[PDB]
Design a protein around this ligand. Structure first.
Ligand SMILES: CC(C)[C@@H]1NC(=O)CCCC/C=C/C=C/CCOC(=O)[C@@H]2CCCN(N2)C(=O)[C@H](Cc2cccc(O)c2)NC1=O
Length: 164
């Protein structure tokens, strides 16, 4: 009933490991579906081959700009940015998957993975999933970030899809 999807993470093209996510389709169906479909690539576009453009150790890893690859782009499966679905789920700790945005109701494809409890994001960013397996891989990804977020190596989603 709740999809599981995975990313295979690579560092400058070399496999690091697999991160899998439970998507909370029972609580945020529209936001979950967006990420799910972009993870399978089923519409002809999505996350495969894209990079994590901003990694800030102790805070979060942000990705999802598969159109411009620099953090300015990305697009939802809905033909336009979409509304903040709800704010039921909170940023409770490491592993929380949540939507990046440019203000209220501007969800696209960019998302972030928390690497700490970030409760100050509640009510601003829509939480729609959590890491299930491979949190250690997300932690390792932090090695390649910095205080301002620029990455020291290219951190990419070499492959991704749905497991369940
Ligand atoms: C999706 C994309 C088109 C979007 N871009 C625009 O709004 C234009 C200007 C961005 C300025 C960038 C600031 C970066 C600051 C570094 C620390 O915080 C971040 O990395 C945040 C973490 C939550 C997810 N997120 N970026 C975003 O959603 C950020 C906005 C943000 C910044 C800081 C705190 C915060 O809660 C939210 N938005 C974006 O990245």
């Amino acid at each position: 009933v709740n999809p599981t999807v995975f990313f295979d993470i690579a560092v400058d093209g070399e496999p690091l490991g697999r991160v899998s996510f439970e998507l909370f389709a029972d609580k945020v169906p529209k936001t979950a579906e967006n990420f799910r479909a972009l993870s399978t690539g089923e519409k002809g576009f999505g996350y495969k081959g894209s990079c994590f453009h901003r990694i800030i150790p102790g805070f979060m890893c942000q990705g999802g700009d598969f159109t411009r690859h620099n953090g300015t782009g990305g697009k939802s499966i809905y033909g336009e940015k979409f509304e903040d679905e709800n704010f039921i789920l909170k940023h409770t700790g490491p592993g929380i998957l949540s939507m990046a945005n440019a203000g209220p109701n501007t969800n696209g494809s960019q998302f972030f993975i928390c690497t700490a409890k970030t409760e100050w994001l509640d009510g601003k960013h829509v939480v729609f999933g959590k890491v299930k397996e491979g949190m250690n891989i997300v932690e390792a990804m932090e090695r390649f970030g910095s205080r301002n977020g620029k990455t020291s190596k290219k951190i990419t989603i070499a492959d991704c899809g749905q497991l369940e």
